[PDB]
Amino acid sequence: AKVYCCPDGGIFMNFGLELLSQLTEKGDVIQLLGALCRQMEDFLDNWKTVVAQKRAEHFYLNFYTAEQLVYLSSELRKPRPSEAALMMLSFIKGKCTVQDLVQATSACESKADRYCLREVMKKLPQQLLSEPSLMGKLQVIMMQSLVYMSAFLPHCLDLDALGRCLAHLATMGGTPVERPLPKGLQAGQPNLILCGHSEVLPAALAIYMQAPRQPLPTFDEVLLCTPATTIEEVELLLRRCLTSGSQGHKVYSLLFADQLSYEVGCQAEEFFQSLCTRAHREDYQLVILCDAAREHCYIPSTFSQYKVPLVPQAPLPNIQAYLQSHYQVPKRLLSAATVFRDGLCVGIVTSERAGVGKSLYVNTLHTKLKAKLRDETVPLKIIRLTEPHLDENQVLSALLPFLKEKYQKMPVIFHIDISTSVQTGIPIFLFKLLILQYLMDINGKIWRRSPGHLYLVEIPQPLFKFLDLFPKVTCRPPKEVIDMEPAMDPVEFCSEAFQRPYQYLKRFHQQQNLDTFQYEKGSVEGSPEECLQHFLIYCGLINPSWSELRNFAWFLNCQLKDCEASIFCKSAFTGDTLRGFKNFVVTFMILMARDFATPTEEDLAPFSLRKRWESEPHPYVFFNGDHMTMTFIGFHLETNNNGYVDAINPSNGKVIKKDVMTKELFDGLRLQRVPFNIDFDNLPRYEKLERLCLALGIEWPIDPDETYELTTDNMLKILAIEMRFRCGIPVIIMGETGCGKTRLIKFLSDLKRGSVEAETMKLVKVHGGTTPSMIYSKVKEAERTAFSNKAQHKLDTILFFDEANTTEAVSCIKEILCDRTVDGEHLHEDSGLHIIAACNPYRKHSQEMILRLESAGLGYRVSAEETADRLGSIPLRQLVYRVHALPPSLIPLVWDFGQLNDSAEKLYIQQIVQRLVDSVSVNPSETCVIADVLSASQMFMRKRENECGFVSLRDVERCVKVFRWFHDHSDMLLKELDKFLHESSDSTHTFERDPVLWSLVMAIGVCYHASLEEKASYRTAIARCFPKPYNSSRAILDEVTHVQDLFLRGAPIRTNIARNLALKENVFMMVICIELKIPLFLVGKPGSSKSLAKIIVADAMQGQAAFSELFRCLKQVHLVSFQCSPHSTPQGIISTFKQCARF
Ligand SMILES: Nc1ncnc2c1ncn2[C@@H]1O[C@H](COP(=O)(O)OP(=O)(O)OP(=O)(O)O)[C@@H](O)[C@H]1O
Ligand SMILES: [Mg+2]
């Protein structure tokens, strides 16, 4: 429609149909629009009564919603309907091919209908021309469309012809379904059951188990109610239950029918009342199951008259035998199920603890299926599910572009992974896909589970009782197989990476020398049982995973591989006496593997289980790139009194693995000049860089930042990071915001690239709004730039996810670190790309700050009991960092950067001070006063255990930005302050002021002093650091009150105003945090003069139109406001920031 707003403009109207003409009327357009709206409203009512009548008189039209009926009306008249429509029609017939549908549409029409609509199409134009105005012609078109619709649309079936085609398909694939009710339930009324939330789904599996050897139900005959279940499919279930036309007797269940909304339940019960008044069958097996702890909701409190005192309950191995009997795919079908437990079509691969066998079990079955069915083209779809509240629309959207194509229908394995963070959607999804066999978009396509694929679901472990219903694989750790139940996979056993450590630790366990052994690449006679037990001896863990034994074996593989490719084996061959060396190599790499491959409130207890810090021994021996040398660090070698050489840690007499090497080997390493027993703190910078780049394998070093200190701890951290993604272990690091993790990783990347300006480190700031799509896209584009950097410069690339813990998509990061996968597709091993993840520690605020935050203004809106933002029982408001739970298999991989030390804290504060407010003209003495004052503020705030950021150097860089603003304006602010103090005070407050010292007092007032509540303590702590005029708390206090009075006097004058300290503070902070674009958050009681400060600031902060000379030198402010309701969408906040950017 087009509507002309002109005087005598009118309405133009165009149905997109070839037998209708364009309608056009002129006149006053408001009455035309009113008449047109009334007419289309009446037509909407008529259409709703017509479609209700057509659904009442055609049964099988009730399987489908309105949009699904539109899709099938569009598609069945087409000569080759889409496979989505045939999936949708395989619930009426089953195995519905295109020829059955040709027969069903051809056996549907009669010729009387044809020439009746031909008479209508030849009668209609004379009937339109008899109506003069557009209302009359339109009324004729709408009435003829109601009664005779297929004439207007000669390419879609109307609901009559569609309903007859569906009822004709239903008769072709016969053998209907006959189900009896269980005893206790009557077969002519509702049957209410109240049974408790963990019993609704197995009790339903009793009601259908009373007729075994009958196929399992589907989206008809069972509706799983949910909140945000619409009224349409509830009514469609009631239509399918309370109408005649069916061929068998079926049950019709509303499961969880108290989960429905109030409106949906009210509409559902009055629609049930309407369908039981008008016309129905008196055989309706309507069974309703509600949560018995939720009887107050509208469906059980309404239908409590038809309440059954008994709850049907079948035993567990009966339901297991029932579902396994229906999952038993027969032979000669060419299924993917053949390689599961002799054709079982549905699995659950589960475990108790992570990192054991689950994805390896699925990939093992996949190679088994490729080997049995003689093709390498069998697809394995991996559907990663990571969001909490499992969305079936995601699984459905991953299934539709796969398998509606009819291409490799006979084998497909689907690998549906539920991660550990999917806490609130699981049994409904598994009940629909694995038992009810479908997934549905109610305005779209309907998926059915094909008996002929293999849907393997991988779930970690109220839910354990449900998961026992299915044919379940339980994977075990290597300790729990060798006693209860070969455990080691035969492909991994004959792998090279499990074979060098096994063929070395086998010769090492019985004390054989290793003088003339170079592994001879190819599998030894070992068994995987003895391979497993030789790895279980030397790992040090008492109950390891398989991730941990793989990490142990890969570390020893990389170290012994570098040991075989050095000069020392051949030098012991030539010189004939260096023997005993490889025993030393094996013993020391067991020490290093103890460091790397191993670890080891009630809710923060598994995550704050950092039993070790960086303040622990780190004895490292590396072999260099392909050099003739070694690299010893983190330990010294001292001679024991019993004839051997022991390894101790530096600056401490504490032995670490006594008797690693004898005097003969130690003297032989003296004679070969290896760098053993060398201090790394009393050396200059070039020699430290030489030792790093000899250990890191960098030829021709170039120092990227000579200010970054190479203390021996940073040496050990760089060698730890480089070793972990040298051997293949994931790198995830738990540090705070203050530790130099990103600076160390930037130093490592810039040291390794040397001089090329190619982008090597890409830092990704993970935050709470980081969706999985961002992580997936960033990892695959970083992999593209990784391939480009390795092709051009032969250079490795690092992708650093900083604070990769604060999103609920942290499972995605586990996917990229542990099992090397981006949303299903594999990462490339020859790419050259190393993902580092960093995470925040999991500590809780002090109870003083928790009771302070709860009492800030009003309360919180949502209390700490009803808060859905939680880790365990702890709300995230009370945690110091807003972190979510680490996925297991990443807990045994995190390790600790050290926290910070004051020598390399004050030096970084001095670098920030000399960088941003640089000493071009301040002083050197004044910059060390600034640096000492900021250091005193940071060490003040650390001497109370309650700060949310764990205040860092970013706050210090912000605070010298505040200082730089005040110093660039301490030419007119001090003049205007002198005017104000001469007008309104005595001669005491009239001295001349130092614009560097004054601006430091003001930066302290804005940054640190305003936020605190114990301000006198902070002023006395910081007054021990200033020079002469501000040595007291009184001096800093009255100085900042003079300037708060100054900014409030420069505002337009107010009377009858609460001119207290709170208004002065709010106006002062608001002016300055607007000028510097620091975000400010004011919270108080609802009469606290913080709205008054907003009006005063916006009034005073005009650019040249301001009242005073002070605010005429500041900026001009335009405010855009947005009031946050509790039902506020995040699109409104984005809209307001874009509106400010437009201004
Ligand atoms: N039986 C085995 N023998 C040798 N190695 C194994 C075995 N099982 C697993 N692994 C190793 O464990 C590593 C991780 O195991 P996998 O990813 O299959 O466990 P998962 O159960 O999928 O872990 P998660 O619980 O995190 O999903 C794999 O790289 C594999 O090499
Ligand atoms: Mg897995």
PDB file of C-alpha atoms and ligand atoms in Angstrom, residues 351 353-361 363 384 415 417-418 420 458 460 475-476 486-493 498 532 545-550 554 814 818-820 888-890, ligand 1:
ATOM      1  CA  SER A 351      32.576 -39.078  32.822  1.00  0.00           C
ATOM      2  CA  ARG A 353      36.312 -35.923  35.960  1.00  0.00           C
ATOM      3  CA  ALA A 354      37.535 -34.154  32.865  1.00  0.00           C
ATOM      4  CA  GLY A 355      40.267 -35.035  30.432  1.00  0.00           C
ATOM      5  CA  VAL A 356      39.735 -38.759  30.160  1.00  0.00           C
ATOM      6  CA  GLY A 357      38.448 -40.295  26.958  1.00  0.00           C
ATOM      7  CA  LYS A 358      35.227 -38.783  25.731  1.00  0.00           C
ATOM      8  CA  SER A 359      36.193 -36.969  22.549  1.00  0.00           C
ATOM      9  CA  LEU A 360      38.825 -39.628  21.963  1.00  0.00           C
ATOM     10  CA  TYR A 361      36.078 -42.255  22.174  1.00  0.00           C
ATOM     11  CA  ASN A 363      36.978 -39.974  17.246  1.00  0.00           C
ATOM     12  CA  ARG A 384      29.786 -27.286  20.554  1.00  0.00           C
ATOM     13  CA  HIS A 415      29.077 -35.275  18.027  1.00  0.00           C
ATOM     14  CA  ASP A 417      29.241 -31.636  23.034  1.00  0.00           C
ATOM     15  CA  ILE A 418      27.650 -30.182  26.136  1.00  0.00           C
ATOM     16  CA  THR A 420      30.470 -27.792  31.756  1.00  0.00           C
ATOM     17  CA  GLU A 458      29.294 -35.858  25.315  1.00  0.00           C
ATOM     18  CA  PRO A 460      30.410 -34.111  31.947  1.00  0.00           C
ATOM     19  CA  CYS A 475      35.207 -43.053  30.501  1.00  0.00           C
ATOM     20  CA  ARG A 476      37.666 -43.643  33.299  1.00  0.00           C
ATOM     21  CA  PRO A 486      44.054 -52.025  27.604  1.00  0.00           C
ATOM     22  CA  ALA A 487      43.343 -48.524  28.899  1.00  0.00           C
ATOM     23  CA  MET A 488      45.983 -46.792  26.814  1.00  0.00           C
ATOM     24  CA  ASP A 489      44.763 -46.157  23.283  1.00  0.00           C
ATOM     25  CA  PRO A 490      46.640 -48.286  20.724  1.00  0.00           C
ATOM     26  CA  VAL A 491      47.145 -45.382  18.338  1.00  0.00           C
ATOM     27  CA  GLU A 492      48.604 -43.235  21.120  1.00  0.00           C
ATOM     28  CA  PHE A 493      50.769 -46.092  22.403  1.00  0.00           C
ATOM     29  CA  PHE A 498      54.486 -41.784  23.810  1.00  0.00           C
ATOM     30  CA  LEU A 532      50.821 -46.878  31.282  1.00  0.00           C
ATOM     31  CA  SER A 545      43.807 -37.683  33.934  1.00  0.00           C
ATOM     32  CA  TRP A 546      44.785 -38.591  30.421  1.00  0.00           C
ATOM     33  CA  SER A 547      45.402 -34.927  29.661  1.00  0.00           C
ATOM     34  CA  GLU A 548      48.009 -34.946  32.386  1.00  0.00           C
ATOM     35  CA  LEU A 549      49.768 -38.124  31.274  1.00  0.00           C
ATOM     36  CA  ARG A 550      49.740 -36.827  27.701  1.00  0.00           C
ATOM     37  CA  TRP A 554      54.863 -34.805  25.465  1.00  0.00           C
ATOM     38  CA  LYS A 814      39.067 -24.283  26.597  1.00  0.00           C
ATOM     39  CA  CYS A 818      42.753 -28.201  25.163  1.00  0.00           C
ATOM     40  CA  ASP A 819      41.323 -30.007  22.143  1.00  0.00           C
ATOM     41  CA  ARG A 820      42.514 -27.597  19.418  1.00  0.00           C
ATOM     42  CA  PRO A 888      37.854 -28.354  34.132  1.00  0.00           C
ATOM     43  CA  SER A 889      40.756 -29.544  31.978  1.00  0.00           C
ATOM     44  CA  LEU A 890      41.885 -25.919  32.354  1.00  0.00           C
TER      45      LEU A 890
HETATM   46  N1  LIG B   1      43.156 -43.881  26.358  1.00  0.00           N
HETATM   47  C1  LIG B   1      44.043 -42.912  26.058  1.00  0.00           C
HETATM   48  N2  LIG B   1      45.319 -43.180  25.767  1.00  0.00           N
HETATM   49  C2  LIG B   1      46.191 -42.209  25.474  1.00  0.00           C
HETATM   50  N3  LIG B   1      45.881 -40.909  25.443  1.00  0.00           N
HETATM   51  C3  LIG B   1      44.632 -40.511  25.718  1.00  0.00           C
HETATM   52  C4  LIG B   1      43.636 -41.510  26.050  1.00  0.00           C
HETATM   53  N4  LIG B   1      42.499 -40.863  26.273  1.00  0.00           N
HETATM   54  C5  LIG B   1      42.739 -39.553  26.107  1.00  0.00           C
HETATM   55  N5  LIG B   1      44.008 -39.354  25.782  1.00  0.00           N
HETATM   56  C6  LIG B   1      44.585 -38.042  25.530  1.00  0.00           C
HETATM   57  O1  LIG B   1      43.861 -37.109  26.302  1.00  0.00           O
HETATM   58  C7  LIG B   1      43.796 -35.908  25.582  1.00  0.00           C
HETATM   59  C8  LIG B   1      42.488 -35.263  25.935  1.00  0.00           C
HETATM   60  O2  LIG B   1      41.532 -36.292  26.080  1.00  0.00           O
HETATM   61  P1  LIG B   1      40.070 -36.024  25.509  1.00  0.00           P
HETATM   62  O3  LIG B   1      40.037 -34.629  24.982  1.00  0.00           O
HETATM   63  O4  LIG B   1      39.649 -37.147  24.628  1.00  0.00           O
HETATM   64  O5  LIG B   1      39.244 -36.051  26.863  1.00  0.00           O
HETATM   65  P2  LIG B   1      37.824 -35.369  27.054  1.00  0.00           P
HETATM   66  O6  LIG B   1      37.109 -36.307  27.953  1.00  0.00           O
HETATM   67  O7  LIG B   1      37.296 -34.983  25.710  1.00  0.00           O
HETATM   68  O8  LIG B   1      38.157 -34.049  27.889  1.00  0.00           O
HETATM   69  P3  LIG B   1      37.026 -33.055  28.413  1.00  0.00           P
HETATM   70  O9  LIG B   1      36.527 -33.707  29.661  1.00  0.00           O
HETATM   71  O10 LIG B   1      37.778 -31.788  28.633  1.00  0.00           O
HETATM   72  O11 LIG B   1      36.053 -32.981  27.279  1.00  0.00           O
HETATM   73  C9  LIG B   1      43.861 -36.280  24.123  1.00  0.00           C
HETATM   74  O12 LIG B   1      44.849 -35.472  23.496  1.00  0.00           O
HETATM   75  C10 LIG B   1      44.326 -37.702  24.092  1.00  0.00           C
HETATM   76  O13 LIG B   1      45.548 -37.769  23.371  1.00  0.00           O
END
